[PDB]
């Protein structure tokens, strides 16, 4: 971390498909995307 | 009865009698003089002698000169003929417009009204100012007070006051400038003349003004304040009439007092001020009140010295208040006027009982999150907001755009802000805040909400924005 909104990005526009969709699964690289983007879709991981 | 001056130090003179001593509070001729030098009697020092308050300069007074007892406290002309005139601490026209007749004199030292005389009828008075209306209501016939550090915006709030309440007021006005500056009482008397409010033509002025400015001995200051007191003491009870009193600035009063408590000799009591503070300020502020007999709104600007709210001066005049605004520099600094801490000003009208509920949710809301976002703050600060989350950085955006509308436009001030004076009524406050809270407008960028009335002005301000 301590890169400004590197992670918060991605994870915001990654919820934002997750959610207009189809069915969905996700692939994160880079530990942060797993900690953010996560708990609320880790049954879809 | 005819004393001698025997000793003289600044503004405290020391007369002997030799028949006949005067009381406490009697006002004495000093003999000789080209002009009127009243004395204030202050304490018995026995040995037949008296110490005293001078209430002008004191140069020229030789021991031995002669004094002669009035028989009574300072009594100034009080009526409907002290309206649209200009008065002096011991009520002397400074208008040069000839003396003023009137059927009936009032000494300036009165008792405070009685318990029994007391009201507790609140009525919210509404402003037009939107930090003022919304968080910390001012209420007719209540006490209000604006705390300013030096050049913060009490005068300017002051004066958009004057403009938004006074101006429309049924009732009679009065305004006494202690300890201020003189330029002010003549930029205030002109344009009192020019809006009409001082007629020098018909008798249908409605204000009467009492100064003892920054130019005046000690003594001169510390008593002005009594004098205007008793003028609008007159139009509550001698006419039940509902008045307006505006004080600019009720800190040099006890200033005043300060300056002349080591001359009577008495030991200090914390950062040199005079043990008689408290006393000092209360058997005074006790007068300033709302009665059975009539009502009196005042509004008093309270000069914080070094900005430290802890001052004894400042610190001691909270307990009189029913509403406080409190001006900050720190918010000056960042471009918001009026300079209010939202955060710091209170008002006892707000209870959901009286200003209802709506009213009161919406400002506790607006409180709550710009309490929230103060927490925030310490690491915003060193590390910004990136490391913020989601919903943290919700309520910094929502808390910003809170802070910016709570700024506004006074007409008083249209000459600094570059924008025209706005005055919003307050359901469309109570509105246009509900709205921000409510997520209604995370949409718009903050600097639309800066500097407007209306919420509707702060969506246009976006368009132009683009």
Not at chain 2, 63 to 87: C, F, N, Y
Not at chain 2, 115 to 142: C, H, N, R, W
Not at chain 2, 146 to 169: P, Q, R, S
Not at chain 2, 367 to 392: F, H, N, R, V
Request: net charge negative.
């Amino acid at each position: 971390g301590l890169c400004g909104a590197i992670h918060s990005s991605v994870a915001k526009q990654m919820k934002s498909e997750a959610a207009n969709l189809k069915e969905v699964k996700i692939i994160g690289v880079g530990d942060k995307i797993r900690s953010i983007l996560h708990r609320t879709h880790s049954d879809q991981f | 009865t005819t004393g001698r001056i025997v000793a003289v130090i600044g503004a405290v003179v020391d007369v002997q009698f030799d028949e006949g001593l005067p009381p406490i509070l009697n006002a004495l001729e000093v003999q000789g003089r080209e002009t009127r030098l009243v004395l204030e009697v202050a304490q018995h020092l026995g040995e037949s002698t008296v110490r005293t308050i001078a209430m002008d300069g004191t140069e020229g007074l030789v021991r031995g000169q002669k004094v002669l007892d009035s028989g009574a406290p300072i009594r100034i002309p009080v009526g409907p003929e002290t309206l649209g005139r200009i008065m002096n601490v011991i009520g002397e026209p400074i208008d040069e417009r000839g003396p003023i007749k009137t059927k009936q004199f009032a000494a300036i030292h009165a008792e405070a009204p009685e318990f029994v005389e007391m009201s507790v009828e609140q009525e919210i008075l509404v402003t037009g100012i939107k930090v003022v209306d919304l968080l910390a209501p001012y209420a007719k016939g209540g006490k209000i007070g604006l705390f300013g550090g030096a050049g913060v915006g009490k005068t300017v709030l002051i004066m958009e006051l004057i403009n938004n309440v006074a101006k429309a007021h049924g009732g009679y006005s009065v305004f006494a400038g202690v300890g201020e500056r003189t330029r002010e009482g003549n930029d205030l008397y002109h344009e009192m003349i020019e809006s009409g409010v001082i007629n020098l033509k018909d008798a249908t002025s409605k204000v009467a003004l009492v100064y003892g400015q920054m130019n005046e001995p000690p003594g001169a200051r510390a008593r002005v304040a009594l004098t205007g007191l008793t003028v609008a003491e007159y139009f509550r009870d001698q006419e039940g009439q509902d008045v307006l009193l505006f004080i600019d600035n009720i800190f040099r009063f006890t200033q005043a007092g300060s300056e002349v408590s080591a001359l009577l000799g008495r030991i200090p009591s914390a950062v040199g001020y005079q043990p008689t503070l408290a006393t000092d300020m209360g058997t005074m502020q006790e007068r300033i009140t709302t009665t059975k007999k009539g009502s009196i709104t005042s509004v008093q600007a309270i000069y914080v010295p070094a900005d430290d709210l802890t001052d004894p001066a400042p610190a001691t005049t909270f307990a009189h208040l029913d509403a406080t605004t409190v001006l900050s520099r720190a918010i000056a600094e960042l471009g918001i006027y009026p300079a209010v801490d939202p955060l710091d000003s209170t008002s006892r009208i707000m209870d959901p009982n009286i200003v209802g509920s709506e009213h009161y949710d919406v400002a506790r809301g607006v409180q709550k999150i710009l309490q929230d976002y103060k927490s925030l703050q310490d690491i915003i600060a060193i590390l910004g907001m990136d490391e913020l989350s989601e919903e943290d950085k919700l309520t910094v955006s929502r808390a910003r755009k809170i802070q910016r509308f709570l700024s506004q436009p006074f007409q008083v001030a249209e000459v600094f802000t570059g924008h025209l004076g706005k005055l919003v009524p307050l359901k469309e406050t109570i509105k246009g805040f509900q709205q921000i809270l409510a997520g209604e407008y995370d949409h718009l960028p903050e600097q639309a909400f800066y500097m407007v009335g209306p919420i509707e002005e702060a969506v246009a301000k976006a368009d132009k924005l683009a």
